[PDB]
Amino acid sequence: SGLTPCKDSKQFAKREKQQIKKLESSLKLYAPESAPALALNAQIEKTKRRFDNYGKYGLLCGSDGLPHLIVNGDQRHWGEFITPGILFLYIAGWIGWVGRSYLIAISGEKKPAMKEIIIDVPLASRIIFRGFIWPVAAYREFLNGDLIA
Amino acid sequence: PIGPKRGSKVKILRRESYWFKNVGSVVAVDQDPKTRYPVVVRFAKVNYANISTNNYALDEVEEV
């Protein structure tokens, strides 16, 4: 959509050069072997590697020199939004399933409210491993009809 | 004996009650033919006034 790749972005190169020039301005103030100078020299390399990696991944830059993210579902940009999205969904489902399974276990007690303050660690440690298979567990429970009260 | 047997589980049908469509345990029922709300029910959840006991009529209680 009028976007150019990072590796061929003159404004991207200008941003990198300007940041490096600004960083090197403070390097001249200290002795070359001093600890502040050693710490500063490690910052320039980090900037260089970051810019190289951004160029190497085929990110798209506009007229500003800043990368843009395409989330329409293009197969060449699945790492921007699609790939991290499924990971977040899996992790959030794990957390939710563990939290839901803990409450059901203690609901049958005489005083279920007491277990919400003093957490039963031996009981909680067993349920934690069970969240690994939460997609299959939820898929099977939905079909059987036990998901909704 | 008039009313549901004590110890049973009952469902509340009163519209304005905090425990509408909830299940409670019968504590006692009054055998006096003049009492208007003899059935005494006890609930696990307290209402907004921190009370878990209330009296209901015969037609406000459904036996589950």
């Binding site: - | 304005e16 009650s17 709300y37």
Partner: protein, 80 residues
């Protein structure tokens, strides 16, 4: 003044009568409950509307209800 109404879900525990700071309510005999009594509101012209009576009713919903209405000197709590 305000309007105070008493309904038949009363159990006659006498808390509202003790909570009134203006002597509006009183208890009368009534064979409709175990306590054989029910509350009454004969002097509603002295009610100020502080609703201390409703904070004392223990039923699922209040057996004593206060509805605010035309306000006078007595119901405004004015001393000047």
């Amino acid at each position: 003044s305000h309007s105070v109404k008493i309904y038949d879900t009363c159990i006659g525990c006498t808390q509202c009568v003790r909570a009134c700071p203006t002597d509006v309510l009183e208890m009368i005999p009534w064979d409709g409950c175990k306590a054989k009594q029910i509350a009454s509101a004969p002097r509603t012209e002295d009610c100020v509307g502080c609703k201390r009576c409703e904070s004392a009713c223990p039923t699922d919903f209040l057996s004593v209800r206060v509805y605010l209405w035309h306000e006078t000197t007595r119901s405004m709590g004015l001393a000047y």
